Symmetry: D2
Subunit: 236 residues, 4 copies
Amino acid sequence: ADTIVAVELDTYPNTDIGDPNYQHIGINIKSIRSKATTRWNVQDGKVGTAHISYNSVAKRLSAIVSYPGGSSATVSYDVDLNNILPEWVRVGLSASTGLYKETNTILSWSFTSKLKTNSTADAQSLHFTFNQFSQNPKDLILQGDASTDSDGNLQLTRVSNGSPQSNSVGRALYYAPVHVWDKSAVVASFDATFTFLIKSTDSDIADGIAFFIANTDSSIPHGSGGRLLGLFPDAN
Amino acid sequence: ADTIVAVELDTYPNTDIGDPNYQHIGINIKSIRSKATTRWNVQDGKVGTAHISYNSVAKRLSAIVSYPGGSSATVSYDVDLNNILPEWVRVGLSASTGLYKETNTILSWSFTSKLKTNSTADAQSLHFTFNQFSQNPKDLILQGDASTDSDGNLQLTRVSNGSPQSNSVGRALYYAPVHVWDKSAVVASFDATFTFLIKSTDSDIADGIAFFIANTDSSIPHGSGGRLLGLFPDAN
Amino acid sequence: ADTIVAVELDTYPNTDIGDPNYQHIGINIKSIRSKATTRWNVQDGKVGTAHISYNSVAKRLSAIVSYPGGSSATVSYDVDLNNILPEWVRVGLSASTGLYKETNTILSWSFTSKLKTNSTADAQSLHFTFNQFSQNPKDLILQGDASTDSDGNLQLTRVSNGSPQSNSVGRALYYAPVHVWDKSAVVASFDATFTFLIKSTDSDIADGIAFFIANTDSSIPHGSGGRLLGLFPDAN
Amino acid sequence: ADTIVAVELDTYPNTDIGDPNYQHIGINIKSIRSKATTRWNVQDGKVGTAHISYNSVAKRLSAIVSYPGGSSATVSYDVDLNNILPEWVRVGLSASTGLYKETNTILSWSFTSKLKTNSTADAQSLHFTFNQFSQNPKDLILQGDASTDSDGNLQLTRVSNGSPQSNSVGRALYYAPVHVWDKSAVVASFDATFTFLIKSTDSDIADGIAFFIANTDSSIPHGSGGRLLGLFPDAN
Ligand SMILES: [Ca+2]
Ligand SMILES: [Ca+2]
Ligand SMILES: [Ca+2]
Ligand SMILES: [Ca+2]
Ligand SMILES: [Mn+2]
Ligand SMILES: [Mn+2]
Ligand SMILES: [Mn+2]
Ligand SMILES: [Mn+2]
C-alpha cells in the first residue's frame, strides 16, 4: 500500500512531471501524475469553493471548483475506491508553496461519510463542518506549517504580516478516523466541501491546495514540498 | 407530457416492450423501456432496501437493491439530468399489479436534495425521512389505491385481509415541490432510500415498485396500470 | 379560529395592547399578548439572526436574536405544545408595517423537525434550508404583499425602489405540512433559523417579523395588518 | 480532577449515597448524587432507547428513556452547562457491575453538536452515528472492559460465554474532541440517542449505564467501580 487519493487544485504547471501546460484541477490516485485533469483558472484574491463527491455504487469520483461569477471547472475519474483505500482512513487538506508563493487559506470545510448497508438508516456515519477555525483546533491534526490565524481561518501554509512565504508545507486532518468501508457494507459514500483563498502580490504563484484521503497514521512525506503538495515523496 | 425519471424494481418480464426476460431493476429516462437494466431476484416476503444516487458533476444516476444476507444488484446510467428535468419537481413512489399480484409495501422512505452554490451554505436543501407512516399522511399526496395501514406501512397497491389485489395502481408523492436546479446552481445532488416488502401466495407475481421524479403537477396517466407501473401513458 | 404559536421580533411598542415600552422579542401563545418578552434593540440596516428551539421533553420554547458585534437577546417560555397545536401544522414567517414602515427582508431560513421513537431511526422528520430564494418559490405558500426580489431575498412586506411601504402585510409558509407530534411518538422537536434585515430612513419603525407554527390552512386573518403582525384577528 | 456531566441509567439503589430507594434515571452534574432523579423500571432482556438533549438558550438538560409502549421515564434539570464544562470536551458511554451483574450492551449510538456563534451555516458542527459497531473501532477510545462483540454490538462490561461478569468497568469515548462552547458563541446545543440491552439471569442486578461529557483527556477514575458508574473517584 500507502495510499493517497486526493483532489488537487494545481496552481503551477510542472510539464516535466506530467502537469498540463496551464493551471489546472486534477484527480490523484496514488501518484502526483493526475489520473484526470481539467483546465482551471486561479483568480488571485477571491474566495473559491470546492465540492467533492464519490459514491461506491456509481464509482465516479468527481470534483468541481468554483469562483463566484459562474466561472467553474469540473473533473471526474472513474475508479473503485474500495480496492484502493483501506477500510479506515483520515481525511484532510494540505498545501505547499515553492520558490513562488501564495496564501493557501481555508475559510471553511465540510465532510460527510456514510456507511449504510441494509435495513436502511445508518450503520455508521460522520459529518463535520467548520465555518470558523478555533485558535486551538483540538479536533484537527495540524502538520507542518499549518496553523489557524486570528481571523478564524486555517492557514495551511505560512503567512507573515499579510505576506505568504516560500517553501512552506502544511496539512490538516480531521482528528477522528473514518470508516470508509466494511465487508458487510452495501453502499459507501463521502462528500467534501471547503472554501479557499489563494492570493499573492506576484502573478506567478505556486503550488496549490489539495483535499486528501489517506491511512490513519499518514504524515507529511519527505520530498513533499513545492509541487508534491505535501502528498507524495516522489513524482512517480 | 409528464416528464418521468424513474428507477424501477420490475418483478415481471414484459419482453414485448424491451423488458429483459427476467426480474430486474432499471433506470428509465422518459420511457418504460429502461435505458439500463440489471438482473435482480425478488425474495418473496422479505424486507429489501433500495438506494438511489445522483450528483450533477458526476452526471451518473445509479441505484442499488439489496436483501439481508448478501444478495444485491446495481445499475447506473450516465445522463445530464439538467437537460431532462424541469427546474421544479416532486418525488414519489409508485407500484402496480396486473392479473398477477404482489404486496407493494413501503416500510420506510428517505430523501435528500441539495442545490449547491459558492459555499458550504446550501442554496437550497430538503431532507425528509419516514420510518413509519402516519395513518393520515398530510405531507404525502396519495394517488390511486395508495394508502397507509394499521401498522404505519405504505400500501401502494391494495391489500384485503392479508392477500394483495389484481389490477391495482398506487403512487405517493411528497407534498413539497423539490428545487432540482437553479441558474446560480454549481452542483445539484439527490439521494433516496426505501425499504420494501413484496409478498404473494402465488410464485408468479407482477408488476413492481418504482421511485420517480416528475413535474410537480403529475398524476397517474391514463392506462398506465400493471406493466406500465403508473408512470407512462403508452409503452413507447 | 387560527391556532397560532409564534416568536415575534416586535419593532414598535404598542403599550395599549400589552407591549413593553421598548423594542422586544416575544413568545406568543394563541395571542398577540406575549407570554414572555425581553428587551431587544433593533439595529437599522444591519443583518440579524434568530434561533428558535423546542423539544417535547424539555417543554421549553426558547428564542435568541443576535446582530453581528455582540448584542443578543433571549426569551424562553415553559409550555407543552402537545396541548396547544394540532397534530399537523405549517411553519411560516410573517411581517407587517403600520403607519410607520420598515423593510422586513429575509435572506435565509431553515427548519428541522423530528419525531423520535425506539431507535435512531427518526420515526419521521423534515429538514429544509433556504439561503437564496428563487424568483418563484414553488415550495412556499406566499400570502399578502410577500414576494421574492431580484437578489434572491424574500420581502414579506412591500418595498418600492429601495423604499419600504406602509400598511403592508406578508406571510410565507413552507408548502409541506409538518407532523409536529404523533400519539405514538416519544420525543418531538423542532429548530428554526432565519436571517433578517430591518431598514428604514426613519428612526421610528414598525412593526416586526414573526416565525410561526399554525393549523395547516392558516391564512392571513381579517384586519391583522399592523401591531398584529399578520397573525391575529384581534388583540385578545 | 475530571469535570463530568452525565445521564445515569441507575439499576441498583445505593441509598447510603443519595440514591432514591428504587431503580431510576438521573442527571449528574460533577457528582454521583444526581441533581434530579426519576423513577425508572428496568425491563430485563429488552432493548431500551435513550434520548438526551440540551440547548444553551433553554439552559435545560432533559433525558428520556423508554421501551416499546408504554412505557417511558423522563428527567430534566435546569443548568447552564457552558459555565460548567470546558470549551472542548469528549462525549462517551460508561457502565459498571458490582457483586451483582448485568450486560450493558450498546446496540446503537448517535450524537450531534452544533456551535452556532454564527448565522446557520454553523461555525462548527459535528454529527456521528453507529447502528453496528465494528469489531475494531478506530474511532472509539475504548477504556474499560469495553470491547465490541461479534454481533456488532458494544459490550461496555465484560461478558463471558453469554454471561455478564462481576466487578467490571468500561467506557467508550468518541475519538474527535467536541467543541461545546466558544467565547464568540451565540447558541450551542447537543443531542444524543443510544439503544441498550440490560440482561441478566440473576433476579438482582447492577449497576447501570451512563452517557457523559467530560474533559478531553478523561479516563477511568480510581474508586469508580460498581456504584460510581466508572465516572467518579468518590461519592461527594
Ligand atoms: Ca504543480
Ligand atoms: Ca415489467
Ligand atoms: Ca408591537
Ligand atoms: Ca446506583
Ligand atoms: Mn497537477
Ligand atoms: Mn422493466
Ligand atoms: Mn409585543
Ligand atoms: Mn443514582
